[PDB]
Amino acid sequence: KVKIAVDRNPVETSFEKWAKPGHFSRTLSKGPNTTTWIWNLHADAHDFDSHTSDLEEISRKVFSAHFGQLGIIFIWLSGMYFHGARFSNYEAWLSDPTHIKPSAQVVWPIVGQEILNGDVGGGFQGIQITSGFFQLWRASGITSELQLYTTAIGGLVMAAAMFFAGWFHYHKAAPKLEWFQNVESMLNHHLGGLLGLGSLAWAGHQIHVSLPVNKLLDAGVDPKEIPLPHDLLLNRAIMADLYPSFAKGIAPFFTLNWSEYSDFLTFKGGLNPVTGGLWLSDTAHHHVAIAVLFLVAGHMYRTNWGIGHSMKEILEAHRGPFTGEGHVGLYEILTTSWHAQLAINLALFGSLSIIVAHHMYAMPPYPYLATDYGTQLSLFTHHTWIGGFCIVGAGAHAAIFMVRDYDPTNNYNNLLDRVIRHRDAIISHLNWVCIFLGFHSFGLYIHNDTMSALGRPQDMFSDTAIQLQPVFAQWIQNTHFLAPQLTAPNALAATSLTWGGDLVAVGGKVAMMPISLGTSDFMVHHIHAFTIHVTVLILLKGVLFARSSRLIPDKANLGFRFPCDGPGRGGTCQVSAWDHVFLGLFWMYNSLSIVIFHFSWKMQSDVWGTVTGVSHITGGNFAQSANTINGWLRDFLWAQSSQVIQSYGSALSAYGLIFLGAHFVWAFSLMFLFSGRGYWQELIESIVWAHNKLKVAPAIQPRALSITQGRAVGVAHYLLGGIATTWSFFLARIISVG
Amino acid sequence: MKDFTTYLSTAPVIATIWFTFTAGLLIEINRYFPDPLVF
Amino acid sequence: LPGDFGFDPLGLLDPVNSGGFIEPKWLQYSEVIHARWAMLGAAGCIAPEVLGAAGLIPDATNIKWFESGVIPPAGSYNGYWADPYTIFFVEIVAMQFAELRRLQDFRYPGSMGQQYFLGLEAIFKGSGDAAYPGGPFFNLFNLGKTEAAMKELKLKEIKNGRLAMLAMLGYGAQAVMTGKGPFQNLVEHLADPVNNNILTNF
Amino acid sequence: VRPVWFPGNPPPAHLDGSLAGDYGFDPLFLGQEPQTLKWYVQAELVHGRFAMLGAAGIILTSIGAKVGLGFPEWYDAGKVVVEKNNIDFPTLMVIQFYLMGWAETKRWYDFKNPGSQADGSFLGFTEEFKGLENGYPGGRFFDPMGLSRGDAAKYQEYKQKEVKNGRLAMIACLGFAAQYAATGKGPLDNLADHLADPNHVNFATNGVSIPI
Ligand SMILES: CC1=C(C/C=C(\C)CCC[C@H](C)CCC[C@H](C)CCCC(C)C)C(=O)c2ccccc2C1=O
Ligand code: SF4
Numbered sequence A: 001k002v003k004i005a006v007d008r009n010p011v012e013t014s015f016e017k018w019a020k021p022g023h024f025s026r027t028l029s030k031g032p033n034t035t036t037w038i039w040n041l042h043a044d045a046h047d048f049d050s051h052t053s054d055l056e057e058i059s060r061k062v063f064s065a066h067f068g069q070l071g072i073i074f075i076w077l078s079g080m081y082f083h084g085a086r087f088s089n090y091e092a093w094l095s096d097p098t099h100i101k102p103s104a105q106v107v108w109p110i111v112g113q114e115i116l117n118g119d120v121g122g123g124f125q126g127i128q129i130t131s132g133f134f135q136l137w138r139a140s141g142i143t144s145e146l147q148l149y150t151t152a153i154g155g156l157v158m159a160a161a162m163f164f165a166g167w168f169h170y171h172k173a174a175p176k177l178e179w180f181q182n183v184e185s186m187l188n189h190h191l192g193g194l195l196g197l198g199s200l201a202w203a204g205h206q207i208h209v210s211l212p213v214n215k216l217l218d219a220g221v222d223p224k225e226i227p228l229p230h231d232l233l234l235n236r237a238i239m240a241d242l243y244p245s246f247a248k249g250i251a252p253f254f255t256l257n258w259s260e261y262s263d264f265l266t267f268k269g270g271l272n273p274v275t276g277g278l279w280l281s282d283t284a285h286h287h288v289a290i291a292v293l294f295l296v297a298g299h300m301y302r303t304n305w306g307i308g309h310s311m312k313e314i315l316e317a318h319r320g321p322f323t324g325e326g327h328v329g330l331y332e333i334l335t336t337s338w339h340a341q342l343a344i345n346l347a348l349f350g351s352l353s354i355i356v357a358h359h360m361y362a363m364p365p366y367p368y369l370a371t372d373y374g375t376q377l378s379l380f381t382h383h384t385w386i387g388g389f390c391i392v393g394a395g396a397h398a399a400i401f402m403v404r405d406y407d408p409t410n411n412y413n414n415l416l417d418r419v420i421r422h423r424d425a426i427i428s429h430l431n432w433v434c435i436f437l438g439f440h441s442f443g444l445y446i447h448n449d450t451m452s453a454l455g456r457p458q459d460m461f462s463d464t465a466i467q468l469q470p471v472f473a474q475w476i477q478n479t480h481f482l483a484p485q486l487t488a489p490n491a492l493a494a495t496s497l498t499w500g501g502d503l504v505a506v507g508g509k510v511a512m513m514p515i516s517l518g519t520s521d522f523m524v525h526h527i528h529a530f531t532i533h534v535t536v537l538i539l540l541k542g543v544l545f546a547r548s549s550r551l552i553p554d555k556a557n558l559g560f561r562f563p564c565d566g567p568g569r570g571g572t573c574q575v576s577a578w579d580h581v582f583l584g585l586f587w588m589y590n591s592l593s594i595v596i597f598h599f600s601w602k603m604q605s606d607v608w609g610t611v612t613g614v615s616h617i618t619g620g621n622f623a624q625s626a627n628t629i630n631g632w633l634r635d636f637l638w639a640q641s642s643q644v645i646q647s648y649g650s651a652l653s654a655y656g657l658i659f660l661g662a663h664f665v666w667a668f669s670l671m672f673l674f675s676g677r678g679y680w681q682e683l684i685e686s687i688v689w690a691h692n693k694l695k696v697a698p699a700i701q702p703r704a705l706s707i708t709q710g711r712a713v714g715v716a717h718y719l720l721g722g723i724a725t726t727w728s729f730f731l732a733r734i735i736s737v738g
Numbered sequence B: 001m002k003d004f005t006t007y008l009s010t011a012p013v014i015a016t017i018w019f020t021f022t023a024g025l026l027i028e029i030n031r032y033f034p035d036p037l038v039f
Numbered sequence C: 001l002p003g004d005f006g007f008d009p010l011g012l013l014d015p016v017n018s019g020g021f022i023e024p025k026w027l028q029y030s031e032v033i034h035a036r037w038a039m040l041g042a043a044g045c046i047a048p049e050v051l052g053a054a055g056l057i058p059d060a061t062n063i064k065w066f067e068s069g070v071i072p073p074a075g076s077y078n079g080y081w082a083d084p085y086t087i088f089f090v091e092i093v094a095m096q097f098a099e100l101r102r103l104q105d106f107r108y109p110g111s112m113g114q115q116y117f118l119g120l121e122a123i124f125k126g127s128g129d130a131a132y133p134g135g136p137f138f139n140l141f142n143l144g145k146t147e148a149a150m151k152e153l154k155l156k157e158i159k160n161g162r163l164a165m166l167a168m169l170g171y172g173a174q175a176v177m178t179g180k181g182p183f184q185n186l187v188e189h190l191a192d193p194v195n196n197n198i199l200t201n202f
Numbered sequence D: 001v002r003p004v005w006f007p008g009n010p011p012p013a014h015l016d017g018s019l020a021g022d023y024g025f026d027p028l029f030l031g032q033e034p035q036t037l038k039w040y041v042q043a044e045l046v047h048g049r050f051a052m053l054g055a056a057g058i059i060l061t062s063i064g065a066k067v068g069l070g071f072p073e074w075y076d077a078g079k080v081v082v083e084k085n086n087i088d089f090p091t092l093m094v095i096q097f098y099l100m101g102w103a104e105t106k107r108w109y110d111f112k113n114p115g116s117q118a119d120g121s122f123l124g125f126t127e128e129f130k131g132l133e134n135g136y137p138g139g140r141f142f143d144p145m146g147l148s149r150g151d152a153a154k155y156q157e158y159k160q161k162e163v164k165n166g167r168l169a170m171i172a173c174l175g176f177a178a179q180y181a182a183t184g185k186g187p188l189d190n191l192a193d194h195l196a197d198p199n200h201v202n203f204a205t206n207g208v209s210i211p212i
Helices: A034-045 A055-086 A088-096 A134-140 A145-172 A177-181 A184-219 A229-234 A235-243 A244-248 A258-263 A280-297 A313-318 A330-334 A340-363 A373-404 A417-452 A471-486 A519-544 A577-607 A629-640 A653-674 A677-692 A705-738 B002-009 B011-032 C024-053 C084-107 C147-177 C182-191 D034-066 D076-083 D087-111 D153-184 D187-196
Strands: A007-008 A104-105 A127-129 A173-174 A504-506 A509-512 A609-611 A614-616
Touching: A007 A471, A055 A104, A055 A134, A055 A145, A055 A173, A055 A177, A055 A340, A088 A145, A134 A184, A145 A173, A184 A229, A184 A235, A235 A244, A235 D034, A244 A258, A258 A653, A313 A330, A330 A340, A340 A373, A373 A577, A373 A705, A417 A519, A417 A629, A417 B011, A519 A577, A577 A614, A577 A629, A577 A705, A653 A705, B002 B011, C024 C147, C024 C182, C147 C182, D034 D076, D034 D153, D034 D187, D153 D187
Parallel strands: none
Antiparallel strands: A007 A173, A104 A127, A504 A509, A509 A609, A609 A614
């Protein structure tokens, strides 16, 4: 029986514990004697499983935590809109999105940071934002910075509301466990309402606001000349002017004569050529379709009436012969472990964000977005990184669950059980396949460069030399090129030019063209594949042997994170799934760096540039330089390095600055990466002798970090330096050359 | 209230405020007296 | 209790684990509050139009209600002795006082009859029940000294109020669709129950 | 039982009604601490008396302005008088500094040490710098008319009236500041204006205060 179950005034409100460090945990509450006390205090502040054992209270904790998270995000978005409204040239760029660089950040006239307020057009002096807020707002049709002002204001209000919500739901009224567990109710609620309604309301805003105003934009009327949105809502006259279907209002919809509404629900495909954005009619049709889908979807499961479904029942039903108990008890599991749902959602979300970036560069929706090569690249790399990190966090919390909440007594012969059984054969096969992949895919490029230095290019692997043509990908490309003929009769254009076809040009810049695939691209795809397989390997090992191993039959007893079990029996160094996900971070960074390199170079070479033919940025050099790592390094890196290595005296000079600084910090990480906390504490003892020699010892006993903590500090700094170096390089290069 | 005073006498917030004070000192210094080299 | 036909499908009257303002007392309280409000709103919106229809009031009056100026885009009236915001200001402070002291009751019963309030404190003892103070003022005449007729009045109030809420909904919906007076729509659908309907207005 | 600043709710702990103007109003519990509270008492007294000064001088000068006496408008008056005279602004300021510093320092160290300022270490006077109460330095100098030393009841009533008129004077001088900040005119001018048309002379007519 699904209903509302809460507890009134559970938690009080006083700054008392605020004066009490470590109060949340048992041991830390005792106060600091040595320095690691503060570190661990911080480390465990949000480990609510460590805090206590009440599932319900932990649920309430994380609930308020989400509340506050949302509030933070509200704050950030609102401040963005605020600075967009106050310190931007967005209206100038509205008047001309073709020759004004989006800039929203101005600095102060001080010791010399002022030089950076460069010229982005329209007499504006600031920094080019690569975020694309300009094209975003134009697609949404925002015209007056007053609108952004209002927006930021409302965001402030929303954030305040969310934080009060967290406070109330934690201290005034906190729901109850069964209420948190009415899972099918939550699913139906979310699935239907949240998504369907959001999409449908966005479609309505589109239809009644953006499509008219963006239609007039591309019509060419002055921005400050269009009537107001609510005025448009008032006067159906002008709406029928734009599309006469509106003259009939809504009765046709009530007569199922949708055909008439086609004026604004098209199926053109492709971009608006005068704009480079997707066809807004098509966008609204997309979103309304998504809306109807999720709406009808949100009514699947039983909540308080006979109709519906039982997740448990169906999962138990689905069982195969080779599998024993099939999908039984998993209901029990998911109803119980927070980390399970966590890791699930994290992996899914990372994958999503990846797909998001993919389709986004594939078919840019925003006005004149494709022209902003820098914004494209930036958002793409951004979301790719975010997704990968979400993946590894998923692996992390999955292993966390397997350590903590696992119990054999309920899972007797399930998918999980047989997995635990034949894990060794599994991981073995995985090792073998990854080794083969690495060997072949790497040695290809290496043999190429070898024949090169050997003056036998005849014997390389090039699109001219011995070839590896992705016949599959090209065949599929042409397949999509020809699909609308028959497999999509009501289609006008393919969703992407890269299926084949012509080139679209807005302002000389190459907006989009069909892209071919050579043996070079073959090789790079196989590279990516091998790397990802290594990453999944290390993660899978960590999770599969987190609780035990033929080496450590009792590994489950050493907690999730733990330095080692000594140097005994050879040496137990780095034997935690914590260490495993650590290694995974490393290999992942490697993978995604490679992928973004591929993307950037292929874009610059065979896609981007300026139309006249195509003045490709690097003239397609990639096509013949990518087969050899020498060509790679020189023609990509060494070449595009100029922009960053001579950016001084310019507003972009900070790019080279942070370039060198990222170099610095990335090397700084390595001392942690290599050193030894024992040595460190020895130095500590020496220096405390030095201090006490002058009666200047601190009360809190200075202590070298735990092995784990040193590992973490080092890896954080390492990844930071690498990503920042690359980030700076990319930004400077593209701002200079695009 | 006293709880609040104690929370403010906690360490990292004090480090914070002292640093903010010093930094604002020096920034204003450079504002009103730009480009110092000697003396 | 009055107006209870067992009409609680989702079962919002569930007492266990209540709290906040999801709590039967405050709930029905707000119910009757909005119901009385809707009664007043029906009277307000309906009066001037039929009044001008009788011509007993001037034609400068009897503009359609929404054209008052509450939504200036929807149209405003002029001839008001002061500014819209001028009126609105004192209106705010007045209702602030009223609602505040009503709430002070609802949270602390009778607790507005002690601090000196110009002798109007016996008036502000009310009773041990929000939405039903009584007292010398809030019950001028002892109407319902018997509990049977008392609950009769209670049910009548409930039905009338809910119905008036529905009436306000109708007023808003029609005035949005046809953009005319509700009385206008009455005259229309009387001219044609056939040809003057929501089906016609498509 | 005493009329609360907010009827219905109970007063705070450190607020009881012992001092004049106590209506239980410390929604932020700033006076939870006795020392800080007493300090605040003295601070409120001082600031209210200053505001009384401010209002009185302002209203006098404004009358002298509106009626044809050639008195400048207060916010201009300092400049205009320093200009009409041969006085040196920094000299004025520094002498004023000397004086306020000495007297206020005496008051400060009396708050520190309640009675050390009447010891007679000063020239020859004793108990004539002895505070009767916190913020109440009732002596032969700060009460030559000796109101405090007769009818303590009417005296407490006077304390009530003092803090009352003091909060009134504070809000009044803030009001004057606002009137000028809005209209750029004399407060008495704006007064006569609201007299002319209360229906159409107000902040709502200014449109500045309320920005619609
Ligand atoms: C350098 C180093 C140390 C020594 C460095 C340590 C322990 C970190 C010291 C951090 C700070 C500097 C000490 C804390 C300072 C206090 C906050 C005191 C106030 C200081 C003010 C400036 C705020 C290790 O202990 C270690 C352990 C394991 C692997 C690698 C390493 C490692 O590389
Ligand atoms: S402290 Fe380091 S070296 Fe020593 S046993 Fe542990 S992991 Fe190995």
